[PDB]
């Protein structure tokens, strides 16, 4: 057969390590998994004491 | 929002102290009022924010001829609450007149807490109907709250006198308190003592200490009502948003109570819904139809099984509802409480407006009518005579409850678009 089988071997071994370490850095250093459950409290209006205070004040005007 | 609990009578002070001890054990609080290192939760529903980060609870301790209140004092949990609310019989008329003379001082106690709070939403009244010190005094005080405060809500965590009786004056007391509950209260949570005693004798074989376990059951139900308020959810974090869905008209405001773990002192959600529809799990002992059904669960829940299971309860076709209005079984989910042991992980509660309580009300009505027409069980007491020389308030309460039973049975019919 013709194919790369000793040139791809130190290469594909590096691609996966790079991608998984790059994904790991975001979560365990910059807390990207917390920013989602942060925007969920406000932008989806999940949390109580915020939606019941924002909409109730805003709709009195219009 | 912000709720101050009001407790009166010896039994009512017992269940309020049990409620505050349950909330001390539930939240990260010491019995001194000290905040713990693991307390984050919302604690402004029943706990006033004090100065050294103390969540001092909002309680009004009121008593009539105190005996068990000394034992309530004899505890390390009497230093957790009590922000200076202290103050010093067996008939409805006696307790009514006894509250009638002292109304100004207890109203000053209420006024102190009212001006003290930033906001307020509801009044929780914990006392037993026809329990002596609770009855009469509670109806007078209820008249005074809804006369003085029409801006708030009234919820009543009460037991109804269903214990099969010697005190024979209790149906008169229950009917007079019931008239005050129908026209001066927005919601009354009704339980049967016999059904709770049957479940308590079912789980273990107790004969005498049923009352202590019933206190724990009412404690878990009252905390279960506000777990979505104290712990961040989404909906019915206002009480009125929860109360509105069950009540179609302000005379039918009585809710059935059921709790699906019955050994309490993981499972599929459609199963515990069908379990919660049983009267073996319901705390209340012709065809009757539910008016509206809304249920709470807090525990180990699959977030996708809710639509599968609500479809399965729908296509099971198990409950038969009321043909004039478009109600639903409404599934609501709350958070399982942290900072406490998570055992019996699935815990559900139901609050539903059913016409089956009209049968129990009609039993008490028939008992009142029989003992009133026979006239050997009111016995013309001096407190009842000094309260009313003519005894027409009992007839007025009879008229109100007769109208109520008529409204009940007309709501069961498909003709309640016109008034009944």
Curated annotation (Swiss-Prot), chain A:
Family: Belongs to the TUBGCP family.
Section covered of the full-length record: 1482 to 1543 of 1819
Function: Component of the gamma-tubulin ring complex (gTuRC) which mediates microtubule nucleation. The gTuRC regulates the minus-end nucleation of alpha-beta tubulin heterodimers that grow into microtubule protafilaments, a critical step in centrosome duplication and spindle formation.
Compartment(s): Cytoplasm, Cytoskeleton, Microtubule organizing center, Centrosome
Quaternary context: Component of the gamma-tubulin ring complex (gTuRC) consisting of TUBGCP2, TUBGCP3, TUBGCP4, TUBGCP5 and TUBGCP6 and gamma-tubulin TUBG1 or TUBG2. TUBGCP2, TUBGCP3, TUBGCP4, TUBGCP5 and TUBGCP6 assemble in a 5:5:2:1:1 stoichiometry; each is associated with a gamma-tubulin, thereby arranging 14 gamma-tubulins in a helical manner. Gamma-tubulin at the first position is blocked by TUBGCP3 at the last position, allowing 13 protafilaments to grow into a microtubule.
Source domain of life: Eukaryota
Associated pathology: Microcephaly and chorioretinopathy, autosomal recessive, 1: A syndrome characterized by microcephaly, cognitive impairment, underdeveloped retina and choroid, and epilepsy in some patients. The more anterior parts of the retina, near the periphery and pars plana, have a grayish hue and diminutive vasculature similar to retinopathy of prematurity. Visual impairment becomes evident during the first year of life.
Name of this protein: Gamma-tubulin complex component 6
From Swiss-Prot, chain B:
Annotated positions binding GTP: 130-136
Effect seen on changing residue 360 to P: In CDCBM4; the chaperonin-dependent folding and hence the yield of monomeric gamma-tubulin is compromised
GO function term, MF aspect, one: GTP binding
Keywords: Cytoplasm, Cytoskeleton, Disease variant, GTP-binding, Lissencephaly, Microtubule, Nucleotide-binding, Phosphoprotein
Family to which this protein belongs: Belongs to the tubulin family.
Task of the protein: Tubulin is the major constituent of microtubules, protein filaments consisting of alpha- and beta-tubulin heterodimers. Gamma-tubulin is a key component of the gamma-tubulin ring complex (gTuRC) which mediates microtubule nucleation. The gTuRC regulates the minus-end nucleation of alpha-beta tubulin heterodimers that grow into microtubule protafilaments, a critical step in centrosome duplication and spindle formation.
GO CC, any one term: cytoplasmic microtubule
Protein name from the UniProt record: Tubulin gamma-1 chain
PROSITE patterns associated with the record: TUBULIN
Keyword Heme belongs to the record: no
Organism this protein belongs to: Homo sapiens (Human)
Assembly with partners or alone: Component of the gamma-tubulin ring complex (gTuRC) consisting of TUBGCP2, TUBGCP3, TUBGCP4, TUBGCP5 and TUBGCP6 and gamma-tubulin TUBG1 or TUBG2. TUBGCP2, TUBGCP3, TUBGCP4, TUBGCP5 and TUBGCP6 assemble in a 5:5:2:1:1 stoichiometry; each is associated with a gamma-tubulin, thereby arranging 14 gamma-tubulins in a helical manner. Gamma-tubulin at the first position is blocked by TUBGCP3 at the last position, allowing 13 protafilaments to grow into a microtubule.
SUPFAM superfamilies named among the record's database cross-references: Tubulin C-terminal domain-like, Tubulin nucleotide-binding domain-like
InterPro entries: Gamma_tubulin, Tub_FtsZ_C, Tubulin, Tubulin/FtsZ-like_C, Tubulin/FtsZ_2-layer-sand-dom, Tubulin/FtsZ_GTPase_sf, Tubulin_C, Tubulin_CS
SMART domains on file: Tubulin, Tubulin_C
One GO term of the biological process aspect: mitotic cell cycle
Pathological condition linked to this protein in its record: Cortical dysplasia, complex, with other brain malformations 4: A disorder of aberrant neuronal migration and disturbed axonal guidance. Clinical features include early-onset seizures, microcephaly, spastic tetraplegia, and various malformations of cortical development, such as agyria, posterior or frontal pachygyria, thick cortex, and subcortical band heterotopia and thin corpus callosum in some patients.
Gene: TUBG1
Subcellular location: Cytoplasm, Cytoskeleton, Microtubule organizing center, Centrosome; Cytoplasm, Cytoskeleton, Spindle
Phosphoserine: residues bearing it: 119
PTM comment, free text: Phosphorylation at Ser-119 by BRSK1 regulates centrosome duplication, possibly by mediating relocation of gamma-tubulin and its associated proteins from the cytoplasm to the centrosome.
């Amino acid at each position: 057969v013709l194919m790369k089988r000793s040139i791809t071997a130190p290469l594909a071994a590096h691609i996966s390590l790079v991608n998984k370490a790059a994904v790991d850095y975001f979560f365990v250093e910059l807390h990207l998994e917390a920013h989602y459950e942060a925007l969920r409290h406000f932008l989806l209006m999940e949390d109580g004491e915020f939606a019941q205070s924002l909409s109730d004040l805003l709709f009195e005007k219009l | 929002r912000e709720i101050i609990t009001l407790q009166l009578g010896q039994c009512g002070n017992q269940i309020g102290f049990e409620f505050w001890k349950q909330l001390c054990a539930e939240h990260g609080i010491s019995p001194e009022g000290i905040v713990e290192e693991f307390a984050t939760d919302r604690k402004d529903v029943f706990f006033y924010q004090a100065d050294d980060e103390h969540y001092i609870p909002r309680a009004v301790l009121l008593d009539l001829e105190p005996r068990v209140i000394h034992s309530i004092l004899n505890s390390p949990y009497a230093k957790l609450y009590n922000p200076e609310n202290i103050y010093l019989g067996n008939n409805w008329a006696s307790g009514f007149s006894q509250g009638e003379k002292i109304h100004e001082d207890i109203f000053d106690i209420i006024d102190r807490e009212a001006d003290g709070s930033d906001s307020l939403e509801g009044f929780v009244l914990c006392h037993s109907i026809a329990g002596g010190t609770g009855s009469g005094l509670g109806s007078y005080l209820l008249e005074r709250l809804n006369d003085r405060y029409p801006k708030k809500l009234v919820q009543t965590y009460s037991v109804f006198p269903n214990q099969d009786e010697d005190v024979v004056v209790q149906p008169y007391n229950s009917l007079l308190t019931l008239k005050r509950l129908t026209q001066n209260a927005d919601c009354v949570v009704v339980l049967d003592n016999t059904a709770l005693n049957r479940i308590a004798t079912d789980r273990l074989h107790i004969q005498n200490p049923s009352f202590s376990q019933i206190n724990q059951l009412v404690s878990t139900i009252m905390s279960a009502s506000t777990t979505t308020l104290r712990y961040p959810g989404y909906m019915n974090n206002d009480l009125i948003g929860l109360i509105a869905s069950l009540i179609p008209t302000p005379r039918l405001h009585f809710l059935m109570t059921g709790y699906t773990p019955l050994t309490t002192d993981k499972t599929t959600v459609l199963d515990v819904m069908r379990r919660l529809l049983q009267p073996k799990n319901v705390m209340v002992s012709t065809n009757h139809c539910y008016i509206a059904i809304l249920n709470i669960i807090q525990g180990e829940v699959d977030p996708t099984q809710v639509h599968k299971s609500l479809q399965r309860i729908r296509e099971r076709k198990l409950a038969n509802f009321i043909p004039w209005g478009p109600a639903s079984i409404q599934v609501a989910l709350s958070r399982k409480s942290p900072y406490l042991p998570s055992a019996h992980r699935v815990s559900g509660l139901m609050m539903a407006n059913h016409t089956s309580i009209s049968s129990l009300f009609e039993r008490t009505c028939r008992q009142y009518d029989k003992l009133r027409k026979r006239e050997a069980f009111l016995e013309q007491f001096r407190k009842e005579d000094m309260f009313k020389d003519n005894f027409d308030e009992m007839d007025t309460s009879r008229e109100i409850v007769q109208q109520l039973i008529d409204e009940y049975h007309a709501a069961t019919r498909p003709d309640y678009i016109s008034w009944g």
